[PDB]
Amino acid sequence: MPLVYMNIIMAFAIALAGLLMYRSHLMSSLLCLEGMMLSLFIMSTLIILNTHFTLANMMPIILLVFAACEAALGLSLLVMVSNTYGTDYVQNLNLLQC
Amino acid sequence: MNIMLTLLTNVTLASLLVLIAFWLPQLNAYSEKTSPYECGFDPMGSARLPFSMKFFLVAITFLLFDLEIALLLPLPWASQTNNLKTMLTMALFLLILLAASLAYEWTQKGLEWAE
Amino acid sequence: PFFDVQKRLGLDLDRWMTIQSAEQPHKIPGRCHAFEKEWIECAHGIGGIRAEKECKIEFDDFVECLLRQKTMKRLSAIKRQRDKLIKEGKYTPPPHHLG
Amino acid sequence: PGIVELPTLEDLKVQEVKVSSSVLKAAAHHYGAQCDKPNKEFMLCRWEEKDPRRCLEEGKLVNQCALDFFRQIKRHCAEPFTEYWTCIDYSGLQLFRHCRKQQAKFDECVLDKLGWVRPDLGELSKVTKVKTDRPLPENPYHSRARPEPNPEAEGDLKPAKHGSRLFFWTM
Amino acid sequence: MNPIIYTTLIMTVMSGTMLVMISSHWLLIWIGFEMNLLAMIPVLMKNFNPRATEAATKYFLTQATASMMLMMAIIINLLYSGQWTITKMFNPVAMTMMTMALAMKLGLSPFHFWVPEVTQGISLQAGLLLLTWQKLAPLSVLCQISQSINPNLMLTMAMLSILIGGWGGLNQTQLRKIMAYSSIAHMGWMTAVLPYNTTMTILNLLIYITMTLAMFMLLIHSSATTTLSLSHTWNKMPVITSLMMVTLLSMGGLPPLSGFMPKWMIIQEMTKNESIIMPTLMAMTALLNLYFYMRLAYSSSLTMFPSTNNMKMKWQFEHTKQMKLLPTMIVLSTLVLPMTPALSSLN
Amino acid sequence: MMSGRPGRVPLQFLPNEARSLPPPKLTDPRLVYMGFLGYCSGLIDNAIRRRPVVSAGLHRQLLYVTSFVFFGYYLLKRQDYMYALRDHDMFAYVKSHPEDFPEKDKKTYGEILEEFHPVR
Amino acid sequence: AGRIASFLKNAWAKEPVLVASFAIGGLAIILPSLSPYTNYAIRINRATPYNYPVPLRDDGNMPDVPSHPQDPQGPSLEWLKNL
Amino acid sequence: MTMYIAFILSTIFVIGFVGFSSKPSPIYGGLGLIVSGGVGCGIVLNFGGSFLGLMVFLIYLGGMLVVFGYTTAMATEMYPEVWVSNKTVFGAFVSGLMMEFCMVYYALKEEEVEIIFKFNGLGDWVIYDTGDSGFFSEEAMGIAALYSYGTWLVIVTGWSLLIGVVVIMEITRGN
DSSP states (O other), X not given: OOHHHHHHHHHHHHHHHHHHSOOSXXXXXXXXXXXXXXXXXXXXXXXXXXXXXXXXXXXXXXXXXXXXXXXXXXXXXHHHHHHHHSSOBTTSTTSOOO | OHHHHHHHHHHHHHHHHHHHHHHSSOOOOOGGGGSXXXXXXXXTTOSSSOOOOSTXXXXXXXXXXXXXXXXXXXXXXXXXXXXXXXXXXXXXXXHHHHHHHHHHHHHSSTTSOOO | OOSOHHHHTTOOSSTXXXXXXXXXXXXXXXXXXXXXXXXHHHSSSSOHHHHHHHTSHHHXXXXXXXXXXXXXXXXXXXXXXXXXXXXXXXXXXXXXXXX | OOOOOOOOTTTTOOOOOXXXXXXXXXXXXXXXXXXXXXXXXXXXXXXXXXOGGGOHHHHHHHHHHHHHHHHHHHHSOOHHHHHHHHHHHHSSSOOSGGGHHHHHHXXXXXXXXXXXXXXOTTGGGSOOEEOOOSOOOSOTTOXXXXXXXXXXXXOOOOOOTXXXXXXXXXX | OOHHHHHHHHHHHHHHHHHHHHXXXXXXXXXXXXXXXXXXXXXXXXXXXXXXXXXXXXXXHHHHHHHHHHHHHHHHHHHHHOOOBOSSOSSHHHHHHHHHHHHHHHTOSSTTSHHHHHHHHSOHHHHHHHHHTTTHHHHHHHHHTGGGOOHXXXXXXXXXXXXXXXXXXXXXXXXXXXXXXXXXXXXXXXXXXXXXOHHHHHHHHHHHHHHHHHHHHHHHHHTXXXXXXXXXXXXXXXXXXXXXXXXXXXXXXXXXXXXXXXXXXXXXXXXXXXXXXXXXHHHHHHHHHHHHHHHHHIIIIISOOOOOSGGGGGGGOOOOOOOTTHHHHHHHTTSOGGGGGGHHHHO | OOTTOTTOOTTOSSOGGGGGSOOOOTTOHHHHHHHHHHHHHHHHHHHHTTOOTTTSXXXXXXXXXXXXXXXXXXXXXXXXXXXXXXXXXXXXXXXXOSTTSOOOOOOOTTTOOOOOOOOO | OHHHHHHHHHHHHHSHHHHHXXXXXXXXXXXXXXXXXXXXXXXXXXXXXXXXXXOEXXXXXXXXXXXXXXXXXXXXXXXXXXX | OGGGHHHHHHHHHHHHHHHHHSOOOHHHHHHHHXXXXXXXHHHHHXXXXXXXXXXXXXXXXXXXXXXXXHHTTTSOOSSOOOTTTSSHHHHHHHHHHHHHHHXXXXXXXXXXXXXXXXXXXXXXXXXXXXXXXXXXXXXHHHXXXXXXXXXXXXXXXXXXXXXXXXXXXXXXXOO
16 A cells, blocks of 8 residues: 555544544634545545546545535534624534533 | 646746745835725724625535536536437436526525625 | 345346446456456355355455555565665666666 | 466567557558458457467467568558658648548559458448467466355245244244 | 425435435445435524524534544445445454444444534424434444444443443433433443344334334423423323323333333343343443433322413413324333234344 | 345345245234234323323224234234244254254263252 | 416516526427437447457357458448438 | 655645644635645546546635635634644644654655555555556546446435535525
């Protein structure tokens, strides 16, 4: 398994860290989330172009089409917490407590 | 190589233009220049406040349509297939779904730029 | 699958793409079409926990066709020894290796 | 797990037909029509044996037959071929479209001197057949012995003994 | 919420789950997972209160991360085997990765802090939907891949699932919260027997399902969210609160009620396979469930609670929304033990 | 004990070879209980809607007891079917694998040396 | 009758773009089934040999398959030339 | 030597990702993602994926555009964060640089890095495959097979995009 596979897998691992280890921002976190799927998109395209998996050539865009949809709602949710709460800073995001 | 050489040439050329732009001229560097601007005044205490907006819906339906545009992009290659009938029906399905999404966007306010 | 409607009601829904020895567009074979044909036709109607051991040598031959871990490691060893002895300077590559 | 079968450096030594892409594309249809048999049998060997080490002789045969064909076309009209291949070379796609004039000037020679005809559209595209005295590749993949199937079971369903037999349930 | 829009959200959620339990290509399983994710967020936002926005946001984050790790497992076993067919994994870390990716969608391990909160946020009908339908897909995937799951991993994960499920519900009065914790406990219950034989986890899934509808329909037939609110309902609906009590008895698994059958079956097959220490832990910890079950029963029916003066005009009004299937829903969740052999039908 | 059984048609309630088994009797004690299981559903239904529990709309009770007893009957055939198959390939596996099931020798109590324990 | 025609007229006046798009779209689906040349398009696509026509091993009793690439028998596309 | 470019294309991918995930100002995470995607398009491209590379180029440089579209709308504030504002971001960044650097140093020395899986440090140019393509690009033909063999895929997608516009309608409707 050559260095390109290491690099994109390692990029995914730090995207996992960055999104999942929240610092203070919801928008930047879902940004890390969509970068996650970019890493997975590149990774998936690699084997598929490598092994002449001709049918699977359509899987990445398919994999793409859904993933942006997630972000399509994610940022859409982001405005809905934003208009009431004011910001995307997730530390006031505490009303649901018990 | 070749293509990459053209991209390199263009980016370096652009950077030389900006470097000459930002370095060659001389400025007295006085404080009151830094005061911001709005048609004679300054932008009071704004130009970074959260932007209470409505065309966010148009912005997001852009992306939602862009996914489907990506889906229908392979068409010129797809038309070169043996079973043209299935390709015809299913591409027509894709454009019909485009139109149906636009229509639901239409009647249910939606693409109507919110007020 | 859990509730395999595919073979019950009689159509393919996703099985066309599952493996890469299927009928590819315009007969474009995969990289490991021969190996995965060998593996699939080896393990057919045998049972996974039984077929995983009879169809082993086919399986790792398939995996080495996919990843070329062993072959590229062999190449790395060859390159290592070549560069070592070239730096310590015994022979020169024949003209086919230069031009 | 096995070593090699690579034929000797003397084995894969044939006269490599050293001509340009434009020349080859100019010959094309006439070359195929007059040299199909070695080509057809060669890649029948290639697809059947799946093994070029078994088809070197076919390669020598196709090379030598194509070379003979090139020798005969050299012996006869070559200046029309020269103009034709130069004109094809000028094209960046080796397009046959902007050469038709010289095309006629070529096709007539090999027609009235070597007795050749330009194959019709799709004529040199249908799949043909050819007899090869070589034996069939019984195991092209050199597959091993296939695993035995699961033990086949049969027998009518007699009622389950003592019902469910789960804890205290009588039936 | 347009009625027809709500129906089209119903059936896209259900079709997303259907795609999961009928597809064979792994990519299709992922597609169904996010179809369900993309479809269930709006119904959780039907009420449109800031608590609902909170619950929907937490659900979205958790499930999106989980589905991305699902694709990670997907890509890894593709890379190491080049086979999208759903079967035994050929790379260990891919199996583990899929295990936590699904678990975060189930709420089993420390990846379970989302479910009590999201259940608190949304309306009780959305709670029924979340805690009943959005389990079938991950359970089905876990059933299809039972050939190679690290037994240590699945066992410990189920153990924490049941343990923090029991402990978390003790200090909760919101009926939605205690129901979420009980569901976490049942999650551990089935997932403990998941590696050994999937027929029994299917049976426990069925029993937990029927019990959960039989529960939630009683809640929103009483229209209660707090323990005190339910206690006030001892008056208006005495039959509803008596059935409240009987199904709360079926909760823990007191024989001969239905809830005892899955515990009995799971323990018997665990003992068939030399796991004798393991079953005793859930057997003991089910008393943790029974504790707040008994507290809910005491507040509901066993002890009369102080009603309110205004409450009396409620006597003049009848529940108009029929909320069908409730009678058989209760009955199947109360008396099916003499029908235990029917489990062989699922096998 | 099964979903990987050869020749297992999916989404098929009652396979054709099940009919060789004795169909459950109409007076099967399990079947009649699940008919009684229908009554509990009907009696509760009147209670939920605070209708007269004993005699509210016998039409509702009829389908409640008839549908439950029906779906019970088909379930019982499948119940017997799987238990039959589990016992069917049972003996097939045993007969096809004599080595794995040695014929244990029977010895009477006069030959064994069980030691009695004085319980005082 | 009158209502449908009046509604069509109003649409052709009120939103002319909508009626033009709906019309040309409605044609776009129903002509390909009606048209008698789509089968000819399938013939076009099958005619192009992107890959090599690998020959068959001759053993006798296949008169259909031509023995030579110049042989008369076999698939032909003179319709392609006339088209 | 431009030999190692197919390596470095991934390498600049990694450290452009770390700063993207270094939790900086949202636009600076966006810039990290942008350089990561721009350099990863080369990674797919030089492997032969021309269409997929340009495809991700287009859709993704629209997708980060829209996530910007609310960053100045629903994410800005009086004092936007800066890529040097917080002190911890520098530590995250440098922890991003030294890990893959140490691992690649090992892969350059031992070629048998033991991190997670099994990997060899002998470049990437080997893993390509000899062969040909005739007169058709494999990637383009494969993605074109979506309308002939992608029977279920296009159906389920288009249905999902319809449901997606519906949910986008409903959640943002604002009563």
